[PDB]
Amino acid sequence: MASMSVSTASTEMSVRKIAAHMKSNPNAKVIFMVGAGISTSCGIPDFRSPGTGLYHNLARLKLPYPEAVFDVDFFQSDPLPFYTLAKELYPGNFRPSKFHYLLKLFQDKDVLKRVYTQNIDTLERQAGVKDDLIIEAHGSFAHCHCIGCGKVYPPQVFKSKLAEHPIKDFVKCDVCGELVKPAIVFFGEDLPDSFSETWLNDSEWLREKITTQQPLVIVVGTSLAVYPFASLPEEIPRKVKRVLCNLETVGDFKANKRPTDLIVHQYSDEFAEQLVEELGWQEDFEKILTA
């Protein structure tokens, strides 16, 4: 849970600007858009990184390249690599980070409009963020369905297969016989309707607040390299302040910077620490963290 700054440079002044904006607009809410960066401190292994036990197990299993684990065609031809990744990444194996708890604090303070996440770890929900405020753009393991006929299956059927040694006899649909898989969006598949639908509604909400207070969209720990999720930032209203907390400037913040863009090069957990400080909520935060 302990963090430190990424470099000798201080980001407290930049983080202070954010707290100042929220101070001047006490009845405004914030929309977060997050990626893998906010869960790195949780110890979740990056399947694309050698030196991770997961990477080598997938390589030993003949996975051709990391992302084939999230490819429909590959899964149907050989589901073992995905099952192996699921065993290691299944929700419940990790604990939320300081940044995940920040989302909870904001909710408690009624300043959370929505959190759009590309992650499948569901640590936002595990941390106590309400279902209504979360948009898991790439799905999660909480639901399962047959890839052929769409029949619904309880998530526990899939989960029970992961505890077997070795993992074999994968879940097959008792209607059409095809493989059943967790509701995780694989490369090549459309995201769930709720993604576009909610962004449609939040986009109007954003544009309408510009004319009344002022909202704020904060992008954290994402390389903005996966679409359509990566299109959100450019679609934020020109008149709505965009904030980016990432080790490096990426996506629209790099391709089309905006005068009002606030860029903060900092670890998501350190950022959380500094924001809570500048907001004066250290007391409530500590309570949540110790709860």
Partner: peptide, 7 residues
């Protein structure tokens, strides 16, 4: 909607 998940 935006299309299918991709790079």
């Amino acid at each position: 909607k935006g299309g299918a998940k991709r790079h």
